[PDB]
């Protein structure tokens, strides 16, 4: 799994945090669970 404050860029596991949202702020660079 991945934490909220942990990028998910091309990941293979979900976010340990269900209240998190793997979103990217920019176009294709920074992407983490917000």
């Amino acid at each position: 799994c991945v934490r909220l404050h942990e990028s998910c860029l091309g990941q293979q596991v979900p976010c340990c945090d269900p209240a998190a949202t793997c979103y990217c702020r920019f176009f294709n660079a920074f992407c983490y669970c917000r």
Side-chain angles (χ1 to χ4, degrees):
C1 68
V2 144
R3 325 314 322 292
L4 190 148
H5 175 243
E6 277 206 352
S7 142
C8 15
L9 270 187
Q11 243 232 137
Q12 240 187 305
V13 240
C15 263
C16 250
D17 279 328
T21 245
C22 180
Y23 101 112
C24 330
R25 180 280 327 252
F26 215 163
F27 224 91
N28 205 273
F30 285 79
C31 209
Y32 25 54
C33 263
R34 173 66 216 88

Short mmCIF file of all heavy atoms in Angstrom, two decimals:
data_model
loop_
_atom_site.label_atom_id
_atom_site.label_comp_id
_atom_site.label_asym_id
_atom_site.label_seq_id
_atom_site.Cartn_x
_atom_site.Cartn_y
_atom_site.Cartn_z
N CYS A 1 0.85 -1.18 0.00
CA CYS A 1 0.00 0.00 0.00
C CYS A 1 0.90 1.24 0.00
O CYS A 1 2.12 1.13 0.11
CB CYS A 1 -0.97 0.00 1.18
SG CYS A 1 -0.18 0.20 2.82
N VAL A 2 0.25 2.39 -0.12
CA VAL A 2 0.98 3.65 -0.14
C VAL A 2 0.28 4.65 0.78
O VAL A 2 -0.95 4.62 0.92
CB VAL A 2 1.12 4.16 -1.58
CG1 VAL A 2 1.03 5.69 -1.63
CG2 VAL A 2 2.42 3.67 -2.21
N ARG A 3 1.08 5.52 1.38
CA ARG A 3 0.55 6.53 2.29
C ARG A 3 -0.03 7.70 1.49
O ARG A 3 0.19 7.81 0.29
CB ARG A 3 1.63 7.04 3.24
CG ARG A 3 2.61 5.93 3.61
CD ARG A 3 1.87 4.64 3.98
NE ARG A 3 0.64 4.97 4.74
CZ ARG A 3 0.64 5.48 5.98
NH1 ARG A 3 1.80 5.73 6.60
NH2 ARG A 3 -0.52 5.75 6.59
N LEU A 4 -0.76 8.55 2.20
CA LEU A 4 -1.36 9.72 1.58
C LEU A 4 -0.27 10.61 0.99
O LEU A 4 -0.31 10.96 -0.19
CB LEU A 4 -2.28 10.44 2.57
CG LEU A 4 -3.17 11.54 1.98
CD1 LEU A 4 -4.49 11.64 2.75
CD2 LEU A 4 -2.43 12.87 1.94
N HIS A 5 0.69 10.95 1.84
CA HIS A 5 1.79 11.80 1.42
C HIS A 5 2.88 10.93 0.77
O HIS A 5 4.06 11.08 1.07
CB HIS A 5 2.32 12.62 2.59
CG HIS A 5 3.54 13.45 2.26
ND1 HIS A 5 4.77 13.26 2.88
CD2 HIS A 5 3.71 14.47 1.37
CE1 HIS A 5 5.63 14.13 2.37
NE2 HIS A 5 4.97 14.88 1.44
N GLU A 6 2.44 10.05 -0.12
CA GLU A 6 3.35 9.17 -0.81
C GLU A 6 2.91 8.99 -2.27
O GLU A 6 1.92 8.32 -2.54
CB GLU A 6 3.46 7.82 -0.10
CG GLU A 6 4.45 7.88 1.06
CD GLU A 6 5.06 6.51 1.35
OE1 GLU A 6 4.57 5.54 0.73
OE2 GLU A 6 5.99 6.46 2.18
N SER A 7 3.68 9.60 -3.16
CA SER A 7 3.38 9.51 -4.58
C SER A 7 2.91 8.10 -4.94
O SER A 7 3.22 7.14 -4.23
CB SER A 7 4.60 9.89 -5.42
OG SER A 7 4.71 9.09 -6.59
N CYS A 8 2.17 8.01 -6.03
CA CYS A 8 1.66 6.73 -6.49
C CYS A 8 2.00 6.58 -7.97
O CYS A 8 1.54 5.65 -8.63
CB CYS A 8 0.16 6.60 -6.23
SG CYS A 8 -0.69 8.17 -5.84
N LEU A 9 2.80 7.51 -8.46
CA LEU A 9 3.21 7.49 -9.86
C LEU A 9 3.46 6.05 -10.29
O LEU A 9 4.36 5.39 -9.78
CB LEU A 9 4.41 8.42 -10.08
CG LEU A 9 4.08 9.87 -10.44
CD1 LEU A 9 5.35 10.64 -10.80
CD2 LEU A 9 3.03 9.93 -11.55
N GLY A 10 2.63 5.60 -11.23
CA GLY A 10 2.75 4.24 -11.74
C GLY A 10 3.03 3.25 -10.60
O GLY A 10 4.08 2.63 -10.56
N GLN A 11 2.05 3.14 -9.71
CA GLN A 11 2.17 2.23 -8.58
C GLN A 11 1.50 0.89 -8.90
O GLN A 11 0.96 0.71 -9.98
CB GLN A 11 1.57 2.85 -7.32
CG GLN A 11 2.65 3.05 -6.24
CD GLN A 11 2.21 2.43 -4.91
OE1 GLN A 11 2.97 1.77 -4.22
NE2 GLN A 11 0.94 2.68 -4.59
N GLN A 12 1.57 -0.01 -7.93
CA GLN A 12 0.98 -1.33 -8.09
C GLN A 12 0.15 -1.70 -6.86
O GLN A 12 -0.48 -2.75 -6.82
CB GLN A 12 2.06 -2.38 -8.36
CG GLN A 12 1.84 -3.07 -9.71
CD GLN A 12 2.81 -4.23 -9.91
OE1 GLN A 12 4.02 -4.08 -9.82
NE2 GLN A 12 2.22 -5.39 -10.18
N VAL A 13 0.18 -0.80 -5.88
CA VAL A 13 -0.56 -1.02 -4.65
C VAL A 13 -1.45 0.20 -4.38
O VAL A 13 -1.13 1.31 -4.80
CB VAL A 13 0.40 -1.33 -3.51
CG1 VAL A 13 0.11 -2.70 -2.90
CG2 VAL A 13 1.86 -1.23 -3.97
N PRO A 14 -2.57 -0.06 -3.66
CA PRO A 14 -3.51 1.00 -3.32
C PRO A 14 -2.95 1.89 -2.20
O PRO A 14 -1.84 1.67 -1.73
CB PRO A 14 -4.79 0.29 -2.93
CG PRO A 14 -4.39 -1.15 -2.61
CD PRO A 14 -2.98 -1.36 -3.14
N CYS A 15 -3.75 2.87 -1.82
CA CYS A 15 -3.35 3.79 -0.76
C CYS A 15 -3.90 3.27 0.57
O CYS A 15 -5.10 3.09 0.72
CB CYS A 15 -3.82 5.22 -1.05
SG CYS A 15 -2.57 6.30 -1.83
N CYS A 16 -2.98 3.02 1.49
CA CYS A 16 -3.35 2.52 2.80
C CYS A 16 -4.45 3.43 3.37
O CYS A 16 -5.26 2.99 4.18
CB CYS A 16 -2.14 2.43 3.74
SG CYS A 16 -1.60 0.73 4.13
N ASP A 17 -4.43 4.67 2.92
CA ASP A 17 -5.42 5.64 3.37
C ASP A 17 -6.58 5.68 2.38
O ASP A 17 -6.41 6.06 1.23
CB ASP A 17 -4.81 7.05 3.43
CG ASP A 17 -3.99 7.34 4.69
OD1 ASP A 17 -4.35 6.77 5.75
OD2 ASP A 17 -3.02 8.12 4.57
N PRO A 18 -7.78 5.26 2.89
CA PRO A 18 -8.97 5.24 2.06
C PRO A 18 -9.52 6.65 1.85
O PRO A 18 -10.19 6.92 0.86
CB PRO A 18 -9.94 4.33 2.80
CG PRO A 18 -9.43 4.25 4.23
CD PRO A 18 -8.01 4.79 4.25
N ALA A 19 -9.21 7.52 2.81
CA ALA A 19 -9.66 8.90 2.74
C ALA A 19 -8.69 9.70 1.88
O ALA A 19 -8.78 10.93 1.83
CB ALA A 19 -9.79 9.46 4.16
N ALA A 20 -7.79 8.99 1.22
CA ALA A 20 -6.81 9.62 0.36
C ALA A 20 -7.25 9.49 -1.09
O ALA A 20 -8.06 8.63 -1.43
CB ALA A 20 -5.43 9.00 0.62
N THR A 21 -6.70 10.36 -1.93
CA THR A 21 -7.02 10.36 -3.34
C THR A 21 -5.76 10.54 -4.18
O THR A 21 -5.18 11.62 -4.21
CB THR A 21 -8.08 11.44 -3.59
OG1 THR A 21 -9.23 10.71 -3.99
CG2 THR A 21 -7.75 12.31 -4.80
N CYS A 22 -5.36 9.46 -4.84
CA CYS A 22 -4.18 9.49 -5.68
C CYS A 22 -4.44 10.43 -6.85
O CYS A 22 -4.95 10.01 -7.89
CB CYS A 22 -3.78 8.09 -6.15
SG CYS A 22 -2.29 8.02 -7.21
N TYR A 23 -4.08 11.69 -6.65
CA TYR A 23 -4.27 12.70 -7.68
C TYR A 23 -2.95 13.41 -8.01
O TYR A 23 -2.04 13.44 -7.18
CB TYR A 23 -5.25 13.72 -7.10
CG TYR A 23 -4.59 15.00 -6.58
CD1 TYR A 23 -4.80 16.19 -7.24
CD2 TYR A 23 -3.78 14.96 -5.47
CE1 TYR A 23 -4.18 17.40 -6.76
CE2 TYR A 23 -3.16 16.16 -4.98
CZ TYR A 23 -3.39 17.32 -5.66
OH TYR A 23 -2.80 18.46 -5.20
N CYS A 24 -2.89 13.95 -9.21
CA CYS A 24 -1.70 14.66 -9.66
C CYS A 24 -2.02 16.15 -9.71
O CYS A 24 -3.00 16.56 -10.33
CB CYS A 24 -1.20 14.13 -11.00
SG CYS A 24 -1.57 12.36 -11.32
N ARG A 25 -1.18 16.93 -9.05
CA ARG A 25 -1.36 18.37 -9.02
C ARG A 25 -1.07 18.98 -10.40
O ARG A 25 -1.85 19.78 -10.90
CB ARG A 25 -0.43 19.02 -7.98
CG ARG A 25 -0.62 20.53 -7.95
CD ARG A 25 0.14 21.21 -9.10
NE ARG A 25 1.39 20.46 -9.38
CZ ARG A 25 2.61 20.90 -9.07
NH1 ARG A 25 2.77 22.08 -8.46
NH2 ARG A 25 3.69 20.15 -9.37
N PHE A 26 0.05 18.56 -10.97
CA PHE A 26 0.45 19.05 -12.28
C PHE A 26 -0.10 18.15 -13.39
O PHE A 26 -1.10 17.46 -13.19
CB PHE A 26 1.98 19.00 -12.32
CG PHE A 26 2.61 20.15 -13.11
CD1 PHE A 26 3.93 20.45 -12.95
CD2 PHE A 26 1.85 20.87 -13.98
CE1 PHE A 26 4.51 21.51 -13.68
CE2 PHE A 26 2.44 21.94 -14.72
CZ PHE A 26 3.76 22.23 -14.55
N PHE A 27 0.56 18.20 -14.53
CA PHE A 27 0.15 17.41 -15.67
C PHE A 27 0.58 15.95 -15.52
O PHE A 27 -0.25 15.06 -15.36
CB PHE A 27 0.84 18.00 -16.91
CG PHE A 27 -0.08 18.14 -18.12
CD1 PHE A 27 -0.78 19.29 -18.32
CD2 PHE A 27 -0.19 17.12 -19.01
CE1 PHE A 27 -1.63 19.43 -19.45
CE2 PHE A 27 -1.04 17.25 -20.14
CZ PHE A 27 -1.74 18.40 -20.33
N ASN A 28 1.89 15.75 -15.57
CA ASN A 28 2.45 14.41 -15.43
C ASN A 28 3.79 14.50 -14.70
O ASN A 28 4.84 14.33 -15.32
CB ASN A 28 2.69 13.77 -16.80
CG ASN A 28 2.67 12.25 -16.70
OD1 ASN A 28 3.67 11.60 -16.42
ND2 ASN A 28 1.48 11.70 -16.95
N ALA A 29 3.71 14.75 -13.41
CA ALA A 29 4.91 14.86 -12.59
C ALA A 29 4.60 14.38 -11.17
O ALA A 29 4.83 13.21 -10.84
CB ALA A 29 5.42 16.30 -12.62
N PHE A 30 4.09 15.30 -10.37
CA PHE A 30 3.75 14.98 -8.99
C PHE A 30 2.35 14.36 -8.90
O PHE A 30 1.37 14.97 -9.32
CB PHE A 30 3.75 16.30 -8.22
CG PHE A 30 5.16 16.84 -7.92
CD1 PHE A 30 5.86 17.49 -8.88
CD2 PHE A 30 5.70 16.66 -6.68
CE1 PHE A 30 7.16 17.99 -8.61
CE2 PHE A 30 7.00 17.16 -6.41
CZ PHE A 30 7.70 17.81 -7.37
N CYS A 31 2.31 13.16 -8.35
CA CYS A 31 1.05 12.45 -8.20
C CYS A 31 1.10 11.65 -6.90
O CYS A 31 1.90 10.72 -6.76
CB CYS A 31 0.76 11.55 -9.41
SG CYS A 31 -1.02 11.28 -9.75
N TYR A 32 0.24 12.04 -5.97
CA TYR A 32 0.17 11.37 -4.68
C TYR A 32 -1.27 11.33 -4.16
O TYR A 32 -2.18 11.81 -4.82
CB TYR A 32 1.02 12.22 -3.73
CG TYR A 32 1.15 13.68 -4.14
CD1 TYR A 32 0.02 14.44 -4.39
CD2 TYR A 32 2.40 14.25 -4.27
CE1 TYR A 32 0.15 15.81 -4.78
CE2 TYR A 32 2.53 15.63 -4.67
CZ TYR A 32 1.39 16.35 -4.90
OH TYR A 32 1.51 17.65 -5.27
N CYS A 33 -1.41 10.74 -2.98
CA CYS A 33 -2.72 10.62 -2.36
C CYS A 33 -2.99 11.90 -1.56
O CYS A 33 -2.26 12.22 -0.63
CB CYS A 33 -2.83 9.37 -1.49
SG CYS A 33 -3.61 7.93 -2.30
N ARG A 34 -4.05 12.60 -1.96
CA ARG A 34 -4.42 13.83 -1.29
C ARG A 34 -5.72 13.63 -0.50
O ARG A 34 -6.57 12.84 -0.89
CB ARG A 34 -4.62 14.97 -2.30
CG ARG A 34 -5.18 16.22 -1.62
CD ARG A 34 -4.16 16.80 -0.64
NE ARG A 34 -4.86 17.35 0.55
CZ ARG A 34 -5.17 16.63 1.63
NH1 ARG A 34 -4.84 15.33 1.69
NH2 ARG A 34 -5.81 17.21 2.66
#
